[PDB]
Amino acid sequence: KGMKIVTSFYPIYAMVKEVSGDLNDVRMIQSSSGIHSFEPSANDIAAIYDADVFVYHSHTLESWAGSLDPNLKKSKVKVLEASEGMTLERVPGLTLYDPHTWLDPEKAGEEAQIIADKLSEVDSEHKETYQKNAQAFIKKAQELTKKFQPKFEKATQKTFVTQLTAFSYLAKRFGLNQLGIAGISEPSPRQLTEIQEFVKTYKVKTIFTESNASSKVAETLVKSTGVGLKTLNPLESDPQNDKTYLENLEENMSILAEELK
Ligand SMILES: [Zn+2]
Ligand SMILES: [Zn+2]
Ligand SMILES: [Zn+2]
Ligand SMILES: [Zn+2]
Ligand SMILES: [Zn+2]
Ligand SMILES: [Zn+2]
Ligand SMILES: [Zn+2]
Ligand SMILES: [Zn+2]
Ligand SMILES: [Zn+2]
Ligand SMILES: [Zn+2]
Ligand SMILES: [Zn+2]
Ligand SMILES: [Zn+2]
């Protein structure tokens, strides 16, 4: 029992719980369905306003976080932006940035260090603990990287196609390249030829889709490309299981390393 913390979505909950080292109680706004386009409910906003601290990933994703001001209401709350001053990257083809930072383990460690630095500024008593826990995270996240950097170096092919384009940072970590499919749901006889040419050019043996994807899109994908489907998890929603955040990242990069080697 300590500071009452409430987080936006899963990865923030996980990072705050790993940095806090169970020093205090942490909760998460239960974001039904999508977190990428979601404005909070009455209970959620009222409960974050009655909490010791509420932390969110970035203003480029949780736009509704900047609409808060405890000074003009119940002001028990400290609003922390876990990714303040991080180096995000514009989206190709165009100001909009790609907020999917947390999928890169080293960038996840960067965000965890920021979280620890901002949480020790609010909880002096236990700063030595925060800085400690985070510094262990950085180590693990580092080890993980060194575990996969070589097998992705030996990787024959370094490109993967996905229905969910949320892995730019994970790809840049290991020198890979992600691409997207240009057919969504009933494709034309011309779009079919184009997709065949695309699958040929890039020698695509498998198309990746969001975890718990819809069946209607998977069916048309398999029918249009002619290849099987594997699953990648953006961790936008807590996959209820007993695995640690870095283990959930290792899962994604294991799937990738198997497909590419
Ligand atoms: Zn208290
Ligand atoms: Zn989604
Ligand atoms: Zn997303
Ligand atoms: Zn910001
Ligand atoms: Zn950075
Ligand atoms: Zn001290
Ligand atoms: Zn404390
Ligand atoms: Zn490195
Ligand atoms: Zn399903
Ligand atoms: Zn869990
Ligand atoms: Zn491991
Ligand atoms: Zn899993």
Numbering used by the authors: 30 to 123, 136 to 226, 230 to 305
Sentences from the paper on this structure:
Streptococcus pneumoniae scavenges essential zinc ions from the host during colonization and infection. This is achieved by the ATP-binding cassette transporter, AdcCB, and two solute-binding proteins (SBPs), AdcA and AdcAII. AdcAII belongs to the cluster A-I subgroup of SBPs, consisting of a conserved structural fold of two (β/α)4 domains connected by a rigid α-helix, with the metal-binding site located at the interface between the N- and C-terminal lobes (Loisel et al., 2008; Yukl, 2017).
In this study, we investigated the Zn(II)-binding mechanism of AdcAII by mutating each of the four Zn(II)-coordinating residues in the SBP. Structural analyses of Zn(II)-bound AdcAII variants revealed that specific regions within the protein underwent conformational changes via direct coupling to each of the metal-binding residues. The binding site mutations impacted protein conformation and interaction with Zn(II) to differing extents. Quantitative in vitro metal-binding assays combined with affinity determination and phenotypic growth assays revealed that each of the four Zn(II)-coordinating residues contributes to metal binding by AdcAII. Intriguingly, the phenotypic growth impact of the mutant adcAII alleles was, in general, independent of affinity, suggesting that the Zn(II)-bound conformation of the SBP is crucial for efficacious metal uptake. Taken together, these data demonstrate the importance of SBP-metal complex conformation for bacterial Zn(II) uptake.
